[model samples]
Target: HWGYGKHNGPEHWHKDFPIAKGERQSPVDIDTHTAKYDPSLKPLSVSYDQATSLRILNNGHAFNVEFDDSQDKAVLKGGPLDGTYRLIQFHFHWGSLDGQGSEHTVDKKKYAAELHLVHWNTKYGDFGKAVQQPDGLAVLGIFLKVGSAKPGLQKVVDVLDSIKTKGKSADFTNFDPRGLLPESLDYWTYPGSLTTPPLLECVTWIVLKEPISVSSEQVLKFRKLNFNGEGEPEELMVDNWRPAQPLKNRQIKASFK
Candidate 1:
């Protein structure tokens, strides 16, 4: 299996998943100085339904909150997206320490953690079919900085203990993910791929410029999660972030000047 260990980390992923080294792979370092300002870029529009939140689970890699995508209840549109994208799930990436956990960096600066709200193009039917198209996915990336305790995240933290081991899950309902977003909709958009394995090149990354606040104690809660299952030797889930990949021939555009 793939993991963030010495023998199977990002550096070794290209062996099993050759697309890991393909053009437009994700989690690139956002050189803010070089990002071009596009006056034509529209502000992001997001509408999330609290009832769509179904469950939270530890998938050995990271904990994700699954959502119901049977309808267009929770959808993302407008910014760099041609049509509506249905919400699939949202997950996070973090480090063992406070200094580094975010996948995409801002001018080489790392955040304590990062949140990814994954969505798939509605026209494509479902996430399975959407993953195969070039413009099938739109992921909203939010940087989590260590500072004040965000009440919005406490609901998620409260359920971590129930899912401490891999494959564990619990009920997570009526959770409004919109609360986790920063006040500003300004973001940097680019064409990229999934950061993890299967690393499909189908995402339009929309990374928010402003970061939301989360106390250091809250970040430590994520570490309590185990990468291993209940019977295996406990492996604390930390540093679950992919390093920045080469930008190749892509150009990143900014929604604001």
Candidate 2:
């Protein structure tokens, strides 16, 4: 299993997932000065029906809120995407320490945490098929800072206890993901990939500019989940974030002037 430890961490991922070293890799450092202002980038259109939320689980890699994507129950369009993308799931990445952990950095500054809402190009018919194509996935990256406990997040945090162990799952419904986003819809768009295994170069990253606030206490509750199963040596789930990759030849397009 791939891990963040020295033995099987990011440095060793290429052994199994060859595309790890591919150009246009994700979690790149965003230099605001270098980012070009593009008025052509359309404002994002996000629609989520609370009934589409099915369940939440601890998959060991990260805790995710899975949605009922059987149809277009939840979808995102515009903002650099050629067509509509169905929302599959949303997960998070955070650090063990304060003021550090986000995968994508802004001017080399790391936030306390980050959130990823994964979506697939419905035009490809299914996620499995879309993932192999150049434009298979679109992920919304939202930064999290330590501040007042977000009232909206309590619904998610309250269920963490029931899913502390790996593979544990619980019912999660009537939740609209829009509550989780920051006020400003402004973002930075660029080509990237999944921050995890297989490292597929199929992601169109739309990273939000503003960050949402969460209390320090809420951040600690996320660390309660175990990375390994009952039989294996228990591993605390912390520092699951991937390091920022090189920008290479990609140009970042800003949605705001």
Candidate 3:
């Protein structure tokens, strides 16, 4: 029911998901000038097992690559996290045009796309229960810009045709998500929420300052996916990113001075 359309888009999300207007809402414009340098923040450490990747699916909103998080096979540590957070899934957000897509903007500069690697705190039992806690989820965001083709991203793009419509899925294994990250992990950290609905305010966002490259043709492939499932009216899955919300009083910390 909640979607990125005129009637049910972000503006109307508060009707059902009241937290849309919450203080810790996500995708805030990252004003680099006001971001404080935090020496206490540690370098992010991620270890992923290629075998943990399970499948990729189109869940009517965005396509995600699911993982087998039964154990610490793929985990994220250090950074703003308290303990080891197990990898659950990763997805992307983009727009119909290259000019405006990424959810979090830097000084109001938008990117071609954004990738989110979602993890859950093991202390909270599992992802289902973890979503209810303030410190339960840690999402690493990487921005994508138009440039030469990125081999790491090409692997994911190649499989998009298999899951072109909503409710579609296909086996996708042995893919290491670490390859998708940029060279430098320097980032801006803040307490925020899920960019989409149910919009829970439980995520600790770490958005990398550097962006990975993806050719314009590859980005066009993403738009071929549909927002509606098979047997339903056709609607391209473009502009799936949430607009930047107010920052309120939350402080943004930079890993680099």
Candidate 4:
């Protein structure tokens, strides 16, 4: 399986998935000076039902909180989006250490970690179908800094114990993904692809500029999470983030300059 190891990392993804080298690859560096200020960008509209959260799983690639996307149980709209987007799942990427795990960098600064709330356009019917189109998916990126513990995230971290091993899962209900976001809705928007295999060029990236705080101790919980399942030698899951990809000719638009 593809992963962030030396042999199976992003650099070697092209050998498996040819689209890894596509023009719209994701996790790009955002230069504030170069980004355009677009007043026309609407404020993001988010509506998530706490009950939509079904379970949390150790997907081997990352620990994800899966949502029930059968309907628009949780949806995202406005903010440079063409139509309604349904929430599918949310996951995180972090490093083995602090201040170096975020997939996207701002002014070349890497944060301690990153969270991705993935959604797909409702017009396309389902995530599997939408992901194949150019404008199929929308992913919200929130940066995490090392400081005070985030109580909002504490609920999620507390449940990590049951799902530590790869493929393991635990019932995770009544959790609202919206609570994980920052106070400010201002964000940077761009067009990009998924940071994983298949690397489809179908996502419209919305990255929050304001960072949320998480204590160093809380960050350690992620380190204990394993990529290997039971009876395995135990490969600690860390540094699962992909490096910033080339910007090429894409334009990054800022809601607030």
lDDT of prediction 3: 0.93
Off by over 4 Å in 1: none
Model 2 spans > 4 angstroms off: none
- Residues 63-145 of candidate 4 have per-residue lDDT tens digits of 99999998877888999998999999999999988969999999999999999999999999989999999889999999999
lDDT of 3 by residue, 1-257 (tens): 99999999999999999999999999999999999999999999888854389999999999999999998998999998899899999999999999988999999999999999999999999998999999999999999999898888788899999998999999999888878988999999999999999999999999999999999989999999999988899999999999999999799999999
**Model 1 lDDT per residue over 2-29, tens place:** 8899999999999999999999999999
lDDT of each: 0.95, 0.90, 0.93, 0.92
lDDT of residue 152 for candidate 2: 80
Q: How close is candidate 1 to the true structure, as a TM-score?
A: 0.99
Best by lDDT: 1
Angstrom error at residue 141, model 4: 0.4
Q: Which parts of model 3 are misplaced by more than 4 Å? A: none
As for model 2, its CA RMSD to the true structure in angstroms is: 1.1
TM-score of every model versus the real structure: 0.99, 0.97, 0.98, 0.98
Cα misplacement distance, residue 48 of candidate 4 (Å) = 1.7
Q: How well does candidate 4 score on lDDT at residue 143?
A: 98
Per-residue lDDT over 24-134 for candidate 2, one digit per residue giving the tens place of the 0 to 100 score? 888999999999999988999887764378899999888999998789878889999999899999999988886787999999999989999999999999999989989
RMSD of each predicted structure: 0.8, 1.1, 0.9, 1.0
Quote the lDDT for 92 in model 1: 99
Q: What's model 4's overall lDDT?
A: 0.92
Give the 10-residue window scoring lowest on summed lDDT in candidate 1: 42-51
> Would you list the clashing residue pairs of candidate 3?
none
**Lowest lDDT 10-mer window, candidate 4?**
45-54
- Order of the predicted models by lDDT, top scorer first: 1, 3, 4, 2
